[model samples]
Target: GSAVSKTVCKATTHEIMGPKKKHLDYLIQCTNEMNVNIPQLADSLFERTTNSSWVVVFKSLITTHHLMVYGNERFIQYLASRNTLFNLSNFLDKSGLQGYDMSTFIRRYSRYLNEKAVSYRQVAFDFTKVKRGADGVMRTMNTEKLLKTVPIIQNQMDALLDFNVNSNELTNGVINAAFMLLFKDAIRLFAAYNEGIINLLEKYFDMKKNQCKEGLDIYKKFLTRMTRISEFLKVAEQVGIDRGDIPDLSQAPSSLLDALEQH
Candidate 1:
């Protein structure tokens, strides 16, 4: 109650405009809508509320190290096909984390990816072009670059997932590890679908003589596949049990054990 009251006061006192601030506003607004106690939810949604602090640091590390190992080129391509690049930029902007120059973000993010030996980086560097403006501003990051960064973002996501999982394991809390595992699985599945679409498009683009017709078909197919994938992921979200549902890991299935072993 006190935390919520404090957050409400803080939110009301500040001017919310940039990416980080906007995210704060959204957090406050959403929290208000749920009418739940703030401290209760804070532990769960810490990733969303805090800006450029421990959360960001942990995100940079996990994204650069753990998630990148599993991220492939096909995954990046899928994000490109869905115009998810804008979604990321919008996320950064809305969260008030878009303050740094694009180049700075790129370099920081690139180092993170490279350190992780993410295969998507090779595809990105090969396919995407970067140019500097006369004013020395960074201009236009290609889809490939955007795709490569997905793993990095996913790394941040995995941190949240891992945190939930650990809390379930250690505390026998309200959140269960199975929920985290399922969430991770859903994300991986969606990523795979996206990657498959990107690979198909690239293959179509490489065709020589019948390129026009093939490209058209690819475009149509891409749209169709994306819609199907979207629906599938939505189902995952709907049936997707959140950590809040089951607090104890003892009740988790063997499938979770198998999945956790792989990770």
Candidate 2:
């Protein structure tokens, strides 16, 4: 075993944290109590882990291109790495090295692709937001100006899914599984996250109309929405939609809406 081999499991959350950290705290917390805002409550520590200046913070907080380039790629990769690409079933005829669902893979692929594209130059690639896919649309994708980056992803899917058959039985499964393990991860996060956001948005809209003395509820819902919006902003801040899009809940008390105090 390497110095970190016993510390590093071949799988995620299968007590990888436990064996490495000698604590079951995070395992329980993430599984049991991850709210829109929640984790690491367990004092048990493996010890972990950022820095930025105000100008940098202000720009980063407001800049799209800076974010997607530096931030989103890794974010996408993080989600993809955390993601499961559906039940890994062997795929296609010729050398079908894909084991995940076509829909699932593409959806995630599209997501990472579009947002990342929002900020670019001529040497890269050009984009059009004309007709969006991926079930939900992102406005930032519409902001791109220009490709030769990665030699993988959706195009790889294209070649694989060309209905070509290049795999023998033994190899097909492995290929498919490996491919499934590659490229993408989404829908699972989207489904739950999106729906919950919608629900929160509903509450937000409801509060706006009702004015029923539930400022706490409304802003909390907005917090959920803002959290997601902020993430998207981080992903595609180049979209030109700056922090000004955030609400300025004037009516809510400063103490209760403290998080809104400075943004």
Candidate 3:
């Protein structure tokens, strides 16, 4: 649908003359080059709107599909098949992609158009079957064992944090601030951000809340905390206390707040 829209809009509004020209012909060609179903809603909007408003309607449809009302399951389980209900992912998903929102298809656009099959000659077949048994009969290694991994929901945050911390997206200070506040655990939590802090976090929830995944609940706790705790973390940085030593303000004079006042 994106390719269909991009090409047709450019052709009619800029490249050629009008929107009526051989639209089907171009769309048919688009189908062969693109892999996704051309979304029926897109198919009609393309014909119905001008090149200008077409872009607008196209985005609204894509974004709406990406988002949902804050809070339905009769059709979700059996009808929509859990698509738009009992769900939450779109809460912050945004695309700077020129004409489209992030989805299954547009993400693949570049690779799809350039894909080509290649002949292979030298790749080895298998290592598991290469050895023999002590009895001198053929034997195979057990290839069915699953790779071990940490069973935590926030595991994928490492690379993302490394990038942001290094690039200064959140600033080198954010890391020290995080360390001062969350301790080493802050290192793993940055993965929730893509760009723009609060909006990105909302998007993260919108994406995970509706979908079924293992780490969703734990992340929910993190989201619940980090949001309103910005001032707490900031003050902790000033106090110079170990994160594990987190103090309760109501209990005594020392606090994540004490650092700021002391300074």
Candidate 3 colliding pairs: 76-82, 87-210, 88-206, 88-210, 89-206, 89-207, 92-203
**Global fold similarity of model 1 (TM-score):** 0.23
Please list the residue runs of candidate 1 whose C-alpha ends up more than 4 Å from where it truly belongs after superposition.
1-27, 30-143, 157-263
lDDT, candidate 2, 173-194, per-residue tens: 2223322222122212222223
Q: Put down candidate 3 lDDT per residue, 138-241, tens digits, no spaces.
A: 11111111000111212323321222221122222212322322322232233222111222222333343333132233334445344434444445545455
Tens digits of per-residue lDDT for model 1, 119-158: 2333343112123232211123333443334344344333
Worst 10 residues of 2 by lDDT: 42-51
Q: Name the best candidate (by lDDT).
A: 1
RMSD of each: 18.2, 20.9, 21.4
Q: Order the candidates by lDDT, highest first.
A: 1, 3, 2
Model 2 spans > 4 angstroms off? 1-4, 7-140, 143-167, 170-176, 182-263
Q: Write the number of the candidate with greater TM-score, choosing between 1 and 2.
A: 1
TM-score per candidate? 0.23, 0.20, 0.17
Overlapping backbone residue pairs in candidate 2 total 17
After TM-score superposition, what is the CA distance of residue 44 in candidate 1 from its true location, in Å?
15
Task: Give the runs in model 3 whose Cα sits over 4 Å from its true position.
Answer: 1-67, 70-75, 78-97, 100-263
